[PDB]
Amino acid sequence: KFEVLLGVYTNAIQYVRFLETALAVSCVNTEFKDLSRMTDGKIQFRISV
């Protein structure tokens, strides 16, 4: 006369990263190494109209 353990079940997590989501259509990635080429986190632009 016994008792049974009918199953063991675990969810598995998968991911689909940032460059795969379509929210990235809006922004452009960069190195972050050449953030050290600019000084003080600034970038100048001479825009002519």
Partner: peptide, 25 residues
């Protein structure tokens, strides 16, 4: 502008007379 070189990138270096050490301005 607070600092003369904030928004600008640094490319070259002019050394006085000869390219020896960092003593020259």
């Amino acid at each position: 502008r607070q600092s003369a070189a904030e928004g600008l990138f640094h490319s070259f270096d002019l050394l006085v007379g000869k390219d020896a050490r960092e003593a020259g301005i």
